[PDB]
């Protein structure tokens, strides 16, 4: 039974299932939230002891209280598995811990639940018992996780642990108060004392087992490698799926355990060149072996396939399709109507401007308004192609308002196919709107018979009516739904909201004709024709019935906002997937009639990308109302081994439950694993996550089952990771002339400590990031030059904007997608100075390792420095590359060798080109993020390449003058003569480019961090790496070649030859006056005992130390 298991746990305690279901079910819908909060305070959910039963009962009430329908209920199941609401809950707790507790003056008892009213806290429902003044920051501030119910003078906030029924009476009272209309009610959470500090188990990530031995090519103990028959493997693998008759199940089993059955392909006449003719699909559309996903016609991408991203996309697109299915269309017709070529041509440098609203929606809610307004219907003799539903909003008290209505009336006289509606929107509460509307609703029949303007003004004063209260109520709802101010003039044809109107001179009779003409060309005609092509021109029978379709389709052109995503607003509905014949390469799963969601996947089985897509897709199909047509299109061109890994996705469509009812954790277990093959563990985690290994026995970088069978006795690999941080990342800009405010330094703070974190603004589109967990934070400019020239106006937490209400320098993260920011900073008047120009411990060494040999020699590196130094040395490392076995042991090194150590990390920016091999990633962390990795307090760092023996006091290098250089290096030895043929750096390319500069070595170096930032070296390293990374062959060693190619622009200080020694280019005599030896590559265990005699001495010191701790 050879298996490997990987599980992921969050950096916070599990909030009870009770509160999670409340927040997940009432996703955001506050009306659902309080109707369920009432039922949990009633006592209906008290019998739910086993968390599964609690979930079970929530299904009953959601469906029974009308809150959820089966189609959207399946989405509830999947989102609940994902535990989407847990970080939202932890935000309340962190806020309670950092802002609420300190302000709460006095000792709490019986105050498990308490209200906050006017700076006073009350622990009793009676309101007569006030425990204390709520000092410090006022907690009545509007925060994202809040939920406002009712309007009131008093602002009531209930901090509750809902697990105890003691909350129930407090709620009922506040609920009564809010429903009466005396106060605005909002619910915040208190860390429930019934639940334990058991970390939360997360899902929605992927695991990879990379066979690092990929040099092979010309149940199963080793990876079988074939000759030049690779070419067809993708093709026969695809046929193997069709032959199976459990197709997407085969696709998964084959794609996830690819190496296993790799050579077994091309056997038992699976040659099946049936889909060879199926390239009729290829012959007209997209290339062989290309990965393309679509959702209702829209363009889906590789990393829009994180479970979190998909859940919000289903939710938004079901709402869009359901808006269309109120118009009598099927899921397939609705999508084909939306994803039609006539529609795509209406859309497609940089340019955009517009505002539109739903016609179906607005005429349903505002019934007593829209069926009681003066309606001049379009004469039934007008053609389908002429129909339009003009709706005019106007203040009939002012001349400009009544002038626009007159111009609309004259326009209706000329255009037969227009249904004209007039809604009175006054700005004075004394004149009830219902009376002026009913004044002209009497003259509705006699409307448009107005020759002079005075005829309308006189008709407004004739008659006397009663203020129809029902009318006024539906009017207020309309203006709120449509975001229309009182007394403002608006013109809305077919849903396209246009206005407000400044003066009625802007909009005359002739201007209305043109508005119909332009709207007709864009949203009316392409609908009629796309509609007539699909044989659905029967559904459009009336000016109003037509407008509902044209209006919905235009709204399908608005994408995200983008929150969490960077894809601002494109996605053009395509339709060419339909030309492809679905005989061989395609298979479908789900009913095409009841499906609201249409996933059209085009995956190549020989691709590594296909592995993830398939794994997610199975889970996505398990939602009642999701259709999936999977196209398999392989390529004939496979020069190397197509897939170089094993892959599993941790995700479930239905919530997992323990035997005791609690939530069951989701794990990635790989079965029938070869015992002879070398493996590496990698994580396929969503963009906002920072993940490092927690507890593991087996070296995550160097693995083989047969070896741990010979060490532990079992073939069961088990490891744990931690989602340690969630990113707060953003793109900075300058106000008003949008530029890159590079060199700007930032501080993240909380009401707990104001020096939480610090980073600097990057040159590539203003990138910055912070490693944080759910909670309320603030962002201030770092103490100094950043605050001098710049003042941060806002952190764009709501969108690019500016958005009214986003000028808050406050950030709060409450999602597994983090919080994407678009801050805006304006310069202080009359200045134009950049930070670049002005108006800790003795030694600071940093290192990294990625193997137990490198880790054993890293223990030696630390020990060698301390033996030869009488100074305060501090070690800095990259958290995630080290094994947990090494991480468990470093505090014991710190105590025995007398050093301190702080552990840094940074997540590779999404824009920056990543490296697939673990090795190439290692190299990038040494050179690319030096400026941002360390806090702004650290003056200088020194890198020592882990497998090293230092014999000199390293303080000398600290105070070595660099002379205008941000970093200093040790050069290549030209001492050994016999290896001159190997000295490539003094030849052709490296000789012409390096005119006289020496080839420096990326093994030992000094970084004067304050000069590094001052010079902005990192940004130049990063952007140069960018275009060079197109060919990985140019970056032979990106840690070494990058500073060497950049010594022409970024200065390189040269360090003495005594500092660096190698057993290939420096003579043995140099070792006498040695400072550091890299133990040069081209194994190390032999070279260490041979070159350095004291290497054994250090190894043995460590060996005893671990056993000393052991007892
Ligand atoms: C945010 O959340 C709220 C709350 O869920 C939603 O508001 C809902 O708005 C509508 C209009 O007021 C309510 O509609 C309800 O329709 C029920 C009938 O539905 C059936 O229709 C077909 C018939 O063929 C069936 O096939 C189908 O299965 C449906 O079941 C009525 O029975 C409802 O009456 C009463 O229901 C509940 C009791 O169960 C009461 O709490 C209500 O007050 C109501 O008197 C009702 O007419 C819907 O119920 C509203 N909810 C509430 C609680 O008021 C929002 O739409 C939602 N928004 C989003 C974006 O999710
Ligand atoms: C993708 C594909 O092969 N489609 C073919 C099409 O080209 C052909 O015209 C039609 C009738 O023979 O059958 C089908
Ligand atoms: C089975 O494979 C052989 C070799 O490719 C082929 O000649 C034969 O025709 C195949 N069988 C059938 C029934 O086509
Ligand atoms: C460290 O300090 C001791 C005591 O002052 C001194 O004897 C020793 O020489 C120092 N170490 C080195 C390497 O000089
Ligand atoms: Ca080394």
């Amino acid at each position: 039974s050879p298996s490997i298991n990987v599980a992921l746990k969050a950096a916070f305690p599990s909030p009870p299932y009770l509160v999670e279901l409340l927040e997940t079910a009432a996703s955001d819908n506050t009306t659902i939230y309080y109707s369920l909060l009432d039922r949990i305070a009633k006592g209906h959910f008290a019998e739910a002891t086993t968390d599964k039963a609690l979930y079970e009962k929530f299904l009953e009430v959601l469906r029974d209280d009308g809150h959820m329908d089966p189609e959207a209920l399946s989405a509830f199941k999947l989102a609940l598995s994902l535990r989407t609401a847990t970080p939202r809950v932890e935000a309340h707790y962190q806020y309670y811990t950092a802002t609420v507790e300190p302000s709460l003056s006095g000792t709490q008892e019986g105050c498990d639940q308490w209200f906050l009213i006017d700076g006073e806290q009350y622990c009793s429902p009676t309101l007569d018992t006030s425990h204390g003044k709520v000092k410090g920051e006022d907690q009545l501030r509007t925060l994202p996780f809040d939920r406002k119910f009712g309007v009131g003078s008093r602002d009531v906030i209930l901090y509750a642990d809902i697990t105890s029924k003691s909350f129930a009476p407090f709620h009922e009272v506040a609920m009564d108060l809010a429903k009466k209309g005396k106060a605005s009610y909002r619910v915040r959470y208190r860390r429930s004392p019934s639940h334990s500090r058991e970390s939360l188990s997360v899902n929605g990530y992927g695991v990879e087992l990379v066979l690092k031995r990929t040099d092979y090519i010309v149940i199963a103990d080793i990876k079988p490698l074939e000759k030049s028959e690779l070419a067809a493997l993708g093709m026969k693998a695809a046929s193997f799926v069709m032959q199976s008759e459990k197709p997407f199940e085969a696709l998964l089993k084959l794609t996830q355990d690819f190496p296993k059955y790799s050579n077994s392909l091309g056997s038992q006449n699976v040659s099946a060149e049936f889909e060879a003719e199926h390239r009729g699909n290829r012959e007209v559309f997209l290339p062989e072996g290309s990965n393309v996903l679509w959702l209702n016609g829209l363009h889906l991408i590789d990393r829009q396939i994180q479970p979190f991203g998909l859940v919000d996309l289903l939710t938004r697109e079901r709402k869009l399709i359901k808006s269309v299915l109120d118009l009598g269309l099927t899921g397939q017709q609705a999508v084909d109507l939306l994803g039609h070529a006539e529609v795509a041509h209406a859309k497609s440098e940089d340019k955009n401007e517009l505002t539109v609203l739903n016609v179906n929606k607005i005429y349903i809610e505002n019934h007593d308004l829209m069926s009681k307004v003066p309606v001049i219907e379009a004469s039934k003799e007008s053609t389908r192609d002429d129909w339009a539903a003009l709706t005019v909003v106007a203040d009939l008290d002012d001349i400009e308002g009544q002038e626009l209505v007159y111009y609309a009336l004259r326009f209706r006289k000329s255009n037969d196919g227009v249904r004209l509606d007039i809604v009175h929107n006054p700005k004075d509460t004394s004149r009830s709107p219902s009376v002026l509307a009913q004044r002209l609703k009497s003259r509705e029949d006699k409307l448009l018979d107005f020759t002079r303007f005075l005829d309308l003004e006189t008709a407004l004063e004739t008659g006397e009516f009663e203020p129809d209260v029902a009318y006024d109520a539906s009017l207020a709802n309309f203006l709120a739904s449509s975001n229309m101010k009182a007394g403002d003039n608006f013109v809305i044809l077919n849903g396209r909201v246009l206005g407000p109107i400044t003066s009625a001179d802007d909009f005359k009779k002739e201007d209305f004709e043109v508005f119909l003409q332009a709207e007709r060309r864009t949203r009316i005609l392409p609908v009629y024709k796309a509609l007539e092509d699909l044989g659905l021109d029967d559904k459009v029978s009336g000016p109003l019935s037509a407008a509902k379709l044209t209006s919905v389709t235009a709204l399908s052109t608005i994408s995200d906002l983008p929150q969490g995503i960077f894809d601002n607003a494109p996605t053009v509905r395509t339709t060419l997937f339909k030309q492809w014949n679905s005989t061989y390469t395609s298979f479908e799963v789900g009913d095409a009639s009841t499906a609201t969601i249409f996933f059209v996947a085009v995956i190549n089985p020989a691709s590594e990308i296909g592995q993830r897509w398939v794994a997610v897709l199975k889970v996505l199909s398990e939602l009642e109302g999701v259709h999936l047509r999977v196209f398999l299109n392989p390529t004939v061109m496979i020069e190397e081994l197509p897939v170089k890994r094993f892959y599993r996705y941790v995700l479930s469509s239905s919530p997992s439950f323990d035997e005791s009812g609690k939530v069951k954790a989701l794990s990635a277990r790989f079965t029938g694993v070869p015992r002879e093959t070398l493996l590496v563990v990698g994580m396929d985690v969503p963009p906002a996550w920072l993940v490092t290994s927690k507890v593991a026995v087996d070296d995550l970088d160097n693995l083989r089952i047969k070896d741990i069978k010979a060490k532990r006795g079992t073939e069961h690999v088990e490891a744990i990771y931690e989602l340690e941080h969630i990113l707060i990342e953003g793109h900075s800009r300058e106000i008003p002339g949008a530029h890159a405010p590079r060199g700007v330094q930032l501080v993240l703070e909380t009401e707990n400590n104001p020096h939480f974190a610090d980073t600097i603004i990057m040159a590539n589109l203003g990138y910055f990031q912070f490693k944080a967990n759910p909670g309320v934070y603030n962002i201030r400019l770092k103490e100094g030059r950043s605050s001098e020239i710049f003042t941060l106006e806002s952190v764009g937490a709501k969108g690019w904007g500016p958005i009214p209400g986003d000028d808050n320098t406050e950030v709060v993260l409450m999602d597994f997608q983090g919080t994407t920011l678009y801050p805006r900073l304006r310069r202080k008047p009359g200045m134009e100075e950049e930070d670049v120009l002005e108006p800790h411990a003795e030694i600071n060494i940093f290192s990294v390792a990625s193997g137990h040999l490198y880790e054993r020699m890293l223990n030696i590196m630390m020990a060698s420095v301390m033996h030869h130094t009488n100074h305060t040395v501090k070690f800095w490392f990259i958290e995630q590359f080290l094994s947990p076995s090494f991480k468990d042991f470093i505090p014991h090194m710190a105590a025995e060798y007398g050093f301190k150590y702080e552990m840094v990390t940074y997540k590779w920016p999404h824009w920056l080109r990543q490296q697939k091999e673990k090795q190439r990633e290692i190299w990038g962390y040494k050179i690319l993020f030096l400026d941002v990795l360390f806090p702004l307090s650290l003056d200088k760092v020194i890198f020592v390449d882990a497998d090293q023996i230092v014999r000199t006091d390293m303080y000398d290098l600290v105070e070595h003058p660099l002379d205008g250089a941000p970093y200093g290096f040790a050069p290549m030895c030209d001492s050994r003569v016999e290896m001159e043929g190997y000295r490539f750096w003094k030849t052709g390319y490296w000789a012409n480019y390096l005119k006289g500069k020496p080839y420096h070595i990326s093994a030992l170096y000094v970084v004067d961090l304050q000069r590094f930032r001052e010079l902005a070296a990192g940004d130049r390293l990063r952007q140069q790496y960018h275009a060079l990374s197109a060919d990985p062959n140019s970056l032979a060693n990106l840690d070494q070649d990058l500073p060497n190619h950049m010594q022409f622009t970024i200065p390189i200080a040269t360090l003495p030859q005594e500092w660096l020694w190698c057993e290939t280019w420096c003579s043995d005599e140099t070792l006498k006056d040695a400072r550091t030896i890299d133990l040069c590559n081209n194994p190390k265990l032999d070279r260490a005992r041979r070159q350095v005699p004291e290497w054994t001495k250090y190894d043995e010191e460590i060996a005893e130390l671990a056993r000393r701790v052991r007892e």
Side-chain angles (χ1 to χ4, degrees), residues 569-588:
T571 63
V572 182
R573 306 258 170 161
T574 84
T575 187
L576 223 61
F577 48 110
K578 307 258 153 202
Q579 311 299 297
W580 287 24
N581 261 49
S582 62
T583 317
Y584 303 120
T585 67
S586 173
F587 66 91
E588 61 165 321

Side-chain angles (χ1 to χ4, degrees), residues 580-807:
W580 287 24
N581 261 49
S582 62
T583 317
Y584 303 120
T585 67
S586 173
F587 66 91
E588 61 165 321
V589 47
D591 186 31
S593 285
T594 70
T596 304
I597 302 296
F598 290 74
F599 271 109
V600 168
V602 181
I603 297 161
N604 160 32
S607 69
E608 296 198 340
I609 286 301
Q611 298 184 299
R612 169 172 79 260
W613 287 30
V614 169
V616 184
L617 286 169
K618 184 170 198 301
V619 180
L620 312 177
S621 178
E622 299 172 11
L623 311 175
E624 289 75 358
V626 184
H627 177 272
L628 172 55
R629 212 197 303 256
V630 194
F631 268 105
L632 297 181
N633 99 107
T635 193
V636 295
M637 298 136 199
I638 324 170
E639 276 70 280
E640 210 183 351
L641 200 59
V643 170
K644 324 178 177 89
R645 80 190 191 193
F646 264 99
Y647 194 83
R648 205 66 39 105
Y649 217 89
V650 181
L651 183 58
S652 185
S653 73
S654 47
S656 39
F657 295 104
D658 230 348
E659 355 90 15
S660 60
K662 219 246 141 110
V663 190
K664 185 177 180 282
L666 289 159
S667 37
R669 202 171 262 97
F670 298 76
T671 58
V673 184
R675 308 167 171 92
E676 255 190 38
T677 65
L678 256 172
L679 300 175
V680 179
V681 184
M683 275 283 156
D684 194 332
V685 69
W689 294 13
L690 229 167
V691 174
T692 91
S693 52
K694 240 298 144 172
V695 171
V697 35
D698 321 310
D699 182 337
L700 8 142
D701 265 314
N702 307 318
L703 297 140
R704 256 153 76 171
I705 280 176
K706 208 179 131 189
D707 296 56
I708 251 49
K709 173 212 169 165
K711 168 131 250 145
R712 329 225 309 262
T714 179
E715 294 155 337
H716 251 267
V717 177
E718 276 241 8
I720 291 158
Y721 278 82
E722 189 189 61
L723 169 64
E724 53 167 30
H725 295 114
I726 308 180
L727 294 187
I728 326 177
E729 54 224 313
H731 304 297
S732 298
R733 67 130 122 186
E734 196 183 279
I735 275 196
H739 227 109
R742 86 159 174 198
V744 174
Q745 305 188 330
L746 271 185
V747 173
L748 187 67
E749 70 166 271
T750 303
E751 333 316 314
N752 242 20
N753 72 291
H755 200 96
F756 186 62
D758 56 352
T759 196
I760 63 169
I761 305 298
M762 297 189 169
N764 263 25
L765 311 167
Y767 190 79
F768 78 93
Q769 85 173 226
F770 295 113
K771 322 144 225 194
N773 271 273
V776 177
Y777 308 97
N778 189 59
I779 308 167
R780 67 157 174 86
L781 298 136
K782 191 251 196 305
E783 313 126 320
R785 197 44 140 89
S786 309
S787 61
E788 174 189 313
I789 16 102
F790 283 98
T791 173
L792 91 106
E793 192 184 60
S794 147
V795 179
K798 318 225 271 190
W800 179 250
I803 295 171
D806 89 319
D807 67 280

Side-chain angles (χ1 to χ4, degrees), residues 374-666:
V375 175
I376 312 164
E377 279 267 12
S379 183
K380 301 102 229 180
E381 276 78 29
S382 58
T383 53
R384 185 176 68 97
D385 316 332
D386 275 347
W387 295 333
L390 178 60
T391 316
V392 175
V393 176
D395 187 359
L396 290 167
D397 285 280
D398 204 19
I399 174 65
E400 318 275 47
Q402 51 193 348
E403 195 173 351
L404 191 61
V405 165
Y406 178 58
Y407 287 134
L409 280 158
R410 273 177 64 204
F411 161 71
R412 171 56 185 89
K413 292 203 240 193
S414 295
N415 299 76
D416 226 354
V418 178
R419 174 187 180 268
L420 178 62
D421 283 31
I422 300 172
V423 181
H424 173 48
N425 180 213
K427 224 181 187 289
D428 190 26
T429 326
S430 311
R431 313 296 111 87
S432 55
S434 48
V435 300
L436 289 159
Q438 281 164 352
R439 291 274 174 94
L440 287 172
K441 224 244 193 288
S442 60
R443 326 298 286 266
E444 176 214 333
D445 21 296
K446 314 177 194 300
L447 271 175
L448 51 88
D449 300 57
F450 303 96
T451 67
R452 44 191 179 184
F453 178 65
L454 182 62
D455 287 11
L456 181 75
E457 200 159 29
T458 50
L460 269 161
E461 290 109 17
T462 59
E464 176 64 26
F465 284 88
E466 73 300 327
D468 198 2
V469 189
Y471 183 101
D472 290 10
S474 286
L475 170 64
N477 233 315
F478 165 73
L479 304 153
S481 302
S482 307
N483 204 352
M484 301 190 182
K485 308 154 68 257
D488 276 358
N489 327 337
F490 287 92
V491 174
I492 311 104
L493 187 121
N494 277 58
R496 193 192 152 179
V497 172
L498 261 197
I501 303 288
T502 76
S503 294
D505 303 359
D506 292 337
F507 234 88
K508 271 215 203 187
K509 169 185 148 67
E510 290 86 5
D511 300 322
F512 265 93
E513 278 198 30
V514 177
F515 180 44
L516 162 66
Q517 175 165 28
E519 174 89 348
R520 179 179 277 159
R521 189 179 67 94
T522 316
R523 296 158 256 280
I524 272 177
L525 249 171
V527 169
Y528 298 168
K529 292 169 166 164
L531 192 68
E532 71 172 43
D533 206 32
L534 278 135
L536 313 177
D537 61 334
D538 343 314
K539 313 301 188 303
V540 283
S541 309
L544 199 57
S545 296
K548 294 186 159 178
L549 282 172
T550 72
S551 186
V552 177
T553 62
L555 286 170
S556 72
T557 79
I558 299 176
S559 191
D560 316 297
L561 218 122
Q563 311 302 117
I565 320 175
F566 50 88
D567 202 21
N568 270 226
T571 63
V572 182
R573 306 258 170 161
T574 84
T575 187
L576 223 61
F577 48 110
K578 307 258 153 202
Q579 311 299 297
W580 287 24
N581 261 49
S582 62
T583 317
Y584 303 120
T585 67
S586 173
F587 66 91
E588 61 165 321
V589 47
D591 186 31
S593 285
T594 70
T596 304
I597 302 296
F598 290 74
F599 271 109
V600 168
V602 181
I603 297 161
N604 160 32
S607 69
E608 296 198 340
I609 286 301
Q611 298 184 299
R612 169 172 79 260
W613 287 30
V614 169
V616 184
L617 286 169
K618 184 170 198 301
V619 180
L620 312 177
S621 178
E622 299 172 11
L623 311 175
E624 289 75 358
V626 184
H627 177 272
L628 172 55
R629 212 197 303 256
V630 194
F631 268 105
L632 297 181
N633 99 107
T635 193
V636 295
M637 298 136 199
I638 324 170
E639 276 70 280
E640 210 183 351
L641 200 59
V643 170
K644 324 178 177 89
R645 80 190 191 193
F646 264 99
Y647 194 83
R648 205 66 39 105
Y649 217 89
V650 181
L651 183 58
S652 185
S653 73
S654 47
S656 39
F657 295 104
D658 230 348
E659 355 90 15
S660 60
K662 219 246 141 110
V663 190
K664 185 177 180 282
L666 289 159

Side-chain angles (χ1 to χ4, degrees), residues 53-233:
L54 181 50
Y55 149 78
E56 268 211 55
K57 204 62 83 170
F58 259 84
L59 265 66
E60 274 189 27
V61 181
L62 291 163
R63 177 197 63 200
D64 291 345
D65 268 21
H67 304 308
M68 297 187 171
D69 58 285
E71 297 179 8
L73 263 164
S74 198
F76 166 72
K77 258 213 192 216
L78 174 61
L80 179 58
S81 298
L82 289 169
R83 319 202 69 164
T84 59
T86 55
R88 206 186 211 272
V89 170
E90 179 75 13
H92 285 103
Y93 295 173
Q94 200 260 6
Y95 184 61
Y96 190 84
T97 308
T99 307
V100 181
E101 291 181 354
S103 299
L104 205 53
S105 299
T107 58
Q108 314 298 98
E109 189 56 38
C111 304
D112 283 9
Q113 297 86 2
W114 57 270
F115 281 92
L116 171 60
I117 308 170
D118 318 340
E120 277 294 320
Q121 145 226 20
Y122 308 106
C123 302
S124 72
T126 63
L127 204 70
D128 299 326
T129 306
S130 50
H131 192 80
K133 155 73 201 136
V134 180
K135 280 183 168 202
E137 271 201 356
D138 192 31
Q139 287 149 41
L140 307 174
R141 293 199 323 277
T142 174
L143 287 164
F145 41 71
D146 280 299
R147 274 102 190 281
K148 211 173 219 175
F149 188 71
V151 169
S153 48
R154 316 212 148 276
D155 215 322
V156 299
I157 299 185
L158 177 57
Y159 290 90
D161 155 36
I162 302 176
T163 70
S164 72
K165 43 253 200 307
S166 173
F167 140 80
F170 284 87
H171 162 70
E172 286 295 296
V173 167
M175 199 63 168
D176 166 277
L177 149 83
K179 283 208 170 187
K180 288 284 172 207
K182 306 193 194 183
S184 50
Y185 184 38
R186 37 167 134 179
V187 180
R188 289 182 191 178
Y189 304 114
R190 190 180 181 261
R191 187 117 49 187
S192 36
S194 294
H195 223 261
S196 175
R197 160 51 189 86
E198 192 224 352
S199 334
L200 191 109
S201 56
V202 302
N203 57 294
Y205 61 95
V207 188
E208 76 185 25
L209 279 171
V210 174
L211 224 152
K212 47 160 39 138
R213 329 167 313 191
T214 184
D215 32 19
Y216 266 90
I217 291 129
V218 172
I219 176 156
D221 309 336
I222 192 179
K223 64 165 199 168
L225 260 302
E226 76 308 286
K227 287 167 150 187
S228 71
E229 54 242 36
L230 289 164
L233 270 77

Side-chain angles (χ1 to χ4, degrees), residues 854 945-948 1003 1077-1081 1084:
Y854 251 58
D945 168 0
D947 65 270
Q948 261 213 29
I1077 307 127
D1078 190 80
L1079 263 63
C1080 30
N1081 325 318
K1084 231 153 288 169

